[PDB]
Amino acid sequence: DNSQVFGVARIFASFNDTFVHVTDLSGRETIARVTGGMKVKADRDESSPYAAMLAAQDVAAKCKEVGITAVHIKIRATGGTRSKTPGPGGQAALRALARSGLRIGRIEDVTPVPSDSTRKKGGRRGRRL
Amino acid sequence: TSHCRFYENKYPEIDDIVMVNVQQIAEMGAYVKLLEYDNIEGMILLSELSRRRIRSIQKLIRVGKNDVAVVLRVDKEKGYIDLSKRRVSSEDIIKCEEKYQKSKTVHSILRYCAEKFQIPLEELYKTIAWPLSRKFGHAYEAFKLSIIDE
Amino acid sequence: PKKRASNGRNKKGRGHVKPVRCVNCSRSVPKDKAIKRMAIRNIVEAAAIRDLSEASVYAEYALPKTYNKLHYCISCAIHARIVRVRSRTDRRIRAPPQRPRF
Amino acid sequence: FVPVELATTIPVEIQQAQQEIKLFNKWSFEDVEVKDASLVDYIQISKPIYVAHTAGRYANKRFRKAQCPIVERLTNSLMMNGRNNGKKLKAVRIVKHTLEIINVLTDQNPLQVVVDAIINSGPREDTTRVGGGGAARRQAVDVSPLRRVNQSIALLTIGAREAAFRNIKTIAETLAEELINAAKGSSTSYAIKKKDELERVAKSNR
Amino acid sequence: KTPVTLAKVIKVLGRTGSRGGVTQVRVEFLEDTTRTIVRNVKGPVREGDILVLMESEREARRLR
Amino acid sequence: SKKSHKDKAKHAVVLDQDKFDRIMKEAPTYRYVSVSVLVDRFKLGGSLARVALRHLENEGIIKPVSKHSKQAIYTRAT
RNA sequence: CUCUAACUAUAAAAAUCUCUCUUCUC
Ligand SMILES: [Mg+2]
Ligand SMILES: [Mg+2]
Ligand SMILES: [Mg+2]
Ligand SMILES: [Zn+2]
Numbered sequence A: 001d002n003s004q005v006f007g008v009a010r011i012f013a014s015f016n017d018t019f020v021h022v023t024d025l026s027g028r029e030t031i032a033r034v035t036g037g038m039k040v041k042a043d044r045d046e047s048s049p050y051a052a053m054l055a056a057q058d059v060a061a062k063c064k065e066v067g068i069t070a071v072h073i074k075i076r077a078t079g080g081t082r083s084k085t086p087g088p089g090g091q092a093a094l095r096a097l098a099r100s101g102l103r104i105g106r107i108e109d110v111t112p113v114p115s116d117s118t119r120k121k122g123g124r125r126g127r128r129l
Numbered sequence B: 001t002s003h004c005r006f007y008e009n010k011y012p013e014i015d016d017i018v019m020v021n022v023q024q025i026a027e028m029g030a031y032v033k034l035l036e037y038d039n040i041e042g043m044i045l046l047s048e049l050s051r052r053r054i055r056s057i058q059k060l061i062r063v064g065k066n067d068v069a070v071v072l073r074v075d076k077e078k079g080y081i082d083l084s085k086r087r088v089s090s091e092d093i094i095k096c097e098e099k100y101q102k103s104k105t106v107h108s109i110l111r112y113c114a115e116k117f118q119i120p121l122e123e124l125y126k127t128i129a130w131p132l133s134r135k136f137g138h139a140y141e142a143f144k145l146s147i148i149d150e
Numbered sequence C: 001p002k003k004r005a006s007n008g009r010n011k012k013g014r015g016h017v018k019p020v021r022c023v024n025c026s027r028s029v030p031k032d033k034a035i036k037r038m039a040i041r042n043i044v045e046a047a048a049i050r051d052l053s054e055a056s057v058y059a060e061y062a063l064p065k066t067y068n069k070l071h072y073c074i075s076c077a078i079h080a081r082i083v084r085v086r087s088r089t090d091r092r093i094r095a096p097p098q099r100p101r102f
Numbered sequence D: 001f002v003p004v005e006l007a008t009t010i011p012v013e014i015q016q017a018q019q020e021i022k023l024f025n026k027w028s029f030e031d032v033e034v035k036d037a038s039l040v041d042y043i044q045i046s047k048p049i050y051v052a053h054t055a056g057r058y059a060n061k062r063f064r065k066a067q068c069p070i071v072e073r074l075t076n077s078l079m080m081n082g083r084n085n086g087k088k089l090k091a092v093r094i095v096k097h098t099l100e101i102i103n104v105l106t107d108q109n110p111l112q113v114v115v116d117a118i119i120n121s122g123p124r125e126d127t128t129r130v131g132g133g134g135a136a137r138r139q140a141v142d143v144s145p146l147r148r149v150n151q152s153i154a155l156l157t158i159g160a161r162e163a164a165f166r167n168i169k170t171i172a173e174t175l176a177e178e179l180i181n182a183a184k185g186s187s188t189s190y191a192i193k194k195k196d197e198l199e200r201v202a203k204s205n206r
Numbered sequence E: 001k002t003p004v005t006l007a008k009v010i011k012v013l014g015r016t017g018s019r020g021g022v023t024q025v026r027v028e029f030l031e032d033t034t035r036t037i038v039r040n041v042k043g044p045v046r047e048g049d050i051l052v053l054m055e056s057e058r059e060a061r062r063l064r
Numbered sequence F: 001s002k003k004s005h006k007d008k009a010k011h012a013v014v015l016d017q018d019k020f021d022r023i024m025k026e027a028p029t030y031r032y033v034s035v036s037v038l039v040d041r042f043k044l045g046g047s048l049a050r051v052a053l054r055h056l057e058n059e060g061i062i063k064p065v066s067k068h069s070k071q072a073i074y075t076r077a078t
Numbered sequence G: 001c002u003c004u005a006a007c008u009a010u011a012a013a014a015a016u017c018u019c020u021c022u023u024c025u026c
Helices: A049-066 A088-099 B092-116 B121-132 B139-148 C046-054 C075-079 D070-078 D088-104 D110-121 D145-164 D171-183 D190-204 F017-026 F035-040 F047-056
Strands: B017-021 B030-032 B042-044 B066-075 B080-084 C019-021 C028-030 C036-042 C065-071 D125-128 D139-143 E005-016 E022-029 E036-042 E050-053 F062-068 F071-076
Touching: A049 A088, A088 C046, B017 B042, B017 B092, B066 B092, B080 D190, B092 B121, B092 B139, B121 B139, D070 D088, D070 D110, D070 D145, D088 D110, D088 D171, D088 F062, D088 F071, D110 D145, D110 D171, D110 D190, D125 D190, D139 D145, D139 D190, D139 E050, D145 D171, D145 D190, D145 E050, D171 D190, E005 E036, F017 F047, F035 F047, F047 F071
Parallel strands: B042 B080, D139 E036
Antiparallel strands: B017 B066, B030 B042, B066 B080, C019 C028, C036 C065, D125 D139, E005 E022, E005 E050, E022 E036, F062 F071
């Protein structure tokens, strides 16, 4: 190591209100819980890339204040029962973290996936929007 | 002269709740005066206007009335107010109503002197407002205590 | 009338198939008539591969990818442009539409 | 300096040493430039002109508009709400009087004042109504250089109009004062005010 | 803060938007010419122009 | 319709001795004075404003540079 | 006559409808 302060970004990117929540290597001690909805006013563009980008920039400022420079991102979607698909905001949050000085390492896909559990929501014919 | 803002300073603070008076609508939204803070114009954007979908606009703004809202960002350099109507709690709406009525009562009280003695309203309100609003609460309780014991 | 010889199902000898739930509309549908797309994707796009690269220790990273197998319904698939209504004589061509990227 | 003998002599101020072509024989197309590097090639001060009115065929193609002198474009856009439509002669005299006024108050070669007002008055980020049906909301977009220039100039002339209407103040003076207010970042200018409002509606609705 | 940025378009990426008036453009920044970004611009554009951006972080997709 | 104009007289069309002195004193220190610039300072109605302007062009208090109808450009002399 | 690589992203609302229907051999 080059005397680095490693961290984990572990982005959670649903289809609404992208989450950015950095913690230590132990994963227990949280830093900069600020999310996408924190930085947008509509309460509905929370999934938009702008919310995630501003959240990531504020996280980066907090990390520079606390010394964490290089990161280990754990990209997450809602997964499980819900669509198994990454949200649009989380990727933009990851890019914004990449820009603002910080360094990356070992980006991970930590999407929780079931082995056909949980007879899940929707009914037979499913969504009828 | 209806002037000389109710509270300590002319320029509204951040994320603060107000009730506003509507005067005109150009095309985007409406930059309308305020009777909760100093009379500097505060502008509402249509994205932050109606809880229901935007199909009729003249019935929800009702130009020339009092409407509860909350100011998002304030420009204290030369005077621009970004003002928002939607994200207001159903329980804080009562807070806005009561606070606006209290400030209205203060305005009504401290106008009689300025018009009876033709002295500056701003000067008299500046003299009176130091023990008035900042002591520990609104003026009305202080005025009632004073009439029962000055 | 017989629209498709294979009944548009692709079961033909199983009697019953285990249903699967659509990714978007959440409709239960037989797993064979559950039009399926292997969404194999790089975890970030080319507009950010650079941004991540110069902000990366461990030069020339493998940049791990994300894989998924989307089990659409048919209504979502036709609505969300995955499957297209083709002409009568062109239905009988089951090859993928000619090398998406060449 | 080189007075020329003729059977009919054009007067001295028009005849003496004017191989330095001037707009109205008082202001130089030299010593004036575009302060912002972005808008260059779209504020055409390169070609010297003696009268801000030419039989220009400046709308046949997509981008022959940028070859029109900026002063001439201001003249043609000055006369909107064209009860005065046509009547470029009076527009030319209005803008010429405006240039004289700008020369009087803080001279600074009024050509440079016009350029500075254009630079400070053209919005840089705008919005567009592309929200489909349900969530009718407006989204941010960047502004093209020519679009920036046209918005600046039209906003300036419409501000001159709003000042001039049913007002003792003459439109030459109104437009001149708008150019003083727009040369600096003064908020009293109507054009700068609308520019800032549009910039903010773009900023907030990214 | 005045973080105004300048970028020269190198390729016009057709025209996007339901209105049919907004252009996608691939602009390389005048500063740090090695980097390119695609953004939306309202108004007439041609390659070789230089355009002004208040923000340079935002990547612009199709406007639906 | 409504009494919203609330416009006062706002003008004295014919000068007095006091306004005569104010005009002849504030004639300099103004780089530019026009008909409506003179109207702006409330000291004249405006029809006599140009009368006063040309009457300040008697001993060269204010030099003229352009003499077009409805718009003449006058700058203080030094 | 030797060839197995690249990807994006929308579902607001929208009901109803009167006559009068008939003619081809050289
Ligand atoms: Mg449907
Ligand atoms: Mg059928
Ligand atoms: Mg099938
Ligand atoms: Zn489906």
